[PDB]
Design a protein around this ligand. Structure first.
Ligand SMILES: Nc1nc2c(ncn2[C@@H]2O[C@H](COP(=O)(O)OP(=O)(O)NP(=O)(O)O)[C@@H](O)[C@H]2O)c(=O)[nH]1
Ligand SMILES: [Ca+2]
Ligand SMILES: [Ca+2]
Ligand SMILES: [Mg+2]
Ligand SMILES: [Mg+2]
Length: 166
């Protein structure tokens, strides 16, 4: 069957792991255990197609930035995550996009911009600001909450739909 290789990237603490675990395992991880690099695989049906999602949950801690080249080489699509209550994490997206662009040698890599923690009210990144960033990259913007499940399936399935357009 068709396999989609997804990679979840973004600054430390934005909720990459919580998002991935909510999608795959249907529960919310409340505690904060920084990731080195973890892999998840699950067979799902997306738009009538039975397929395998292979998801790489990467490290946001800058200590592990040397690992990025390898996972960017292998990935077919990237979920670029920031948190809506963390302006620095939003600013950090560009360095992830720029490396993906360099490694892929392409301005047309399948990607989705994700604003996580939308259940929280301490918002410093307004929706339109993120819409504008996503527009500049030619990709969709979606808000999610790993805590409430809002938008979670949508974000990952949208990324699959972006891979299919390339
Ligand atoms: N309220 C709320 N908290 C969230 C949400 N997503 C993640 N968190 C919380 O934010 C913290 C960090 O989440 P985590 O998934 O570990 O972040 P990460 O991006 O994987 N970190 P790292 O890059 O270090 O691996 C955890 O305490 C988690 O419960 C969300 O949507 N809403
Ligand atoms: Ca829990
Ligand atoms: Ca692009
Ligand atoms: Mg993590
Ligand atoms: Mg502002």
């Amino acid at each position: 069957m068709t396999e989609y290789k997804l990679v979840v990237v973004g600054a430390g603490g934005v909720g990459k792991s919580a998002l991935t675990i909510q999608l795959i395992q249907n529960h919310f991880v409340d505690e904060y255990d920084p990731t080195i690099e973890d892999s998840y695989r699950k067979q799902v049906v997306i738009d009538g197609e039975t397929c395998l999602l292979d998801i790489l949950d990467t490290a946001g801690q800058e200590e592990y930035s040397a690992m990025r080249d390898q996972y960017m080489r292998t990935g077919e699509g990237f979920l670029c995550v920031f948190a809506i209550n963390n302006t620095k994490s939003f600013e950090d997206i560009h360095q992830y996009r720029e490396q993906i662009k360099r490694v892929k040698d392409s301005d047309d890599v399948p990607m989705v911009l994700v604003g996580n923690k939308c259940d929280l009210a301490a918002r410093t990144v307004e929706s339109r600001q993120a819409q504008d960033l996503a527009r500049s990259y030619g990709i969709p913007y979606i808000e999610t909450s790993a805590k409430t499940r809002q938008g979670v399936e949508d974000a990952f399935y949208t990324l699959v739909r972006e891979i299919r357009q390339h």
